[PDB]
Structure formats: structure tokens, C-alpha cells
Amino acid sequence: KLQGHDVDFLITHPKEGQEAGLLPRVMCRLQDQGLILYHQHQAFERSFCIFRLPQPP
DNA sequence: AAACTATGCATGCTCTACTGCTTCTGATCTAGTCGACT
Ligand SMILES: Nc1ncnc2c1ncn2[C@H]1C[C@H](O)[C@@H](COP(=O)(O)NP(=O)(O)OP(=O)(O)O)O1
Ligand SMILES: [Mg+2]
């Protein structure tokens, strides 16, 4: 598809047994960066958000 | 020699405080239902 309504990703680690708490850390880091308008919760393995994309113009 | 007053005792009622036991209430928590999303 060339058009959509959302962008969906899947995060994994080829090595077994390391992504115990990956998502909270990445989400909080992005929030510190200042891009998440909405976090589903503001250990979980799923979340939907509303990113803040800066357009080139 | 008699009357007044200092001293004390015995008892009931009341404020005040303190310690301990029991019960009630505010606060900390899992099941059911509807709804959101993917
Ligand atoms: N009700 C459901 N039942 C089963 N699987 C589902 C599902 N809803 C989603 N999935 C699975 C399959 C879906 O591909 C994926 C999430 O896809 P989306 O972001 O909800 N819709 P997409 O991005 O594909 O299209 P568009 O750009 O037009 O909005 O999760
Ligand atoms: Mg999507």
C-alpha cells in the first residue's frame, strides 16, 4: 500500500531472551526526545501513540 | 472552769490523667461488565 492510516512496527532481538523490557525504555527515551503526544499508558509488549513528525517546510 | 480555735480523720462527689481491651471506620486491594484498540 502507498497510503495508510497508521505505521506499524515489530521489534525483536535475534538472540533469545533479552527483550524483557525493551518497549518501556524506548518509549520513555522517545518521550524525552519530545515526540510522543499520546502514550497508551500515559511490563507491556504493545502500545499505540501519536507521533509528532516535523515536516521539512 | 468554760468557750473558741488549731489539728486531724473518715467519706462522698468531681476533674484529670493514664493504660489496656474491643469495635468501628478509612484505606489498600481482586472479580464482573462494558468499552477502546489492534
Ligand atoms: N480485528 C482484527 N483481528 C485480527 N487481526 C487484526 C485485527 N485488526 C488488525 N489486525 C492485525 C492485522 C493488521 O494488518 C494489523 C494492524 O493493522 P491496522 O493498522 O489496524 N490496519 P492497516 O495498517 O493494515 O491498514 P490502514 O493503513 O488502511 O489503516 O493487525
Ligand atoms: Mg497500522
Side-chain angles (χ1 to χ4, degrees):
Chain A
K1 268 157 77 84
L2 316 162
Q3 326 307 343
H5 205 121
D6 63 7
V7 183
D8 314 328
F9 284 102
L10 167 56
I11 308 168
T12 178
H13 190 355
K15 276 152 215 164
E16 254 289 20
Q18 295 94 30
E19 96 314 345
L22 211 159
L23 199 73
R25 309 218 284 282
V26 153
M27 222 52 28
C28 67
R29 284 181 46 69
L30 264 159
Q31 175 56 294
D32 162 88
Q33 268 80 89
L35 298 175
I36 291 137
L37 272 78
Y38 196 127
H39 187 197
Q40 180 186 16
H41 332 110
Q42 159 56 9
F44 38 64
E45 317 292 2
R46 175 182 294 91
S47 92
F48 39 90
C49 327
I50 295 168
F51 268 53
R52 209 267 292 159
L53 216 61
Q55 307 321 84

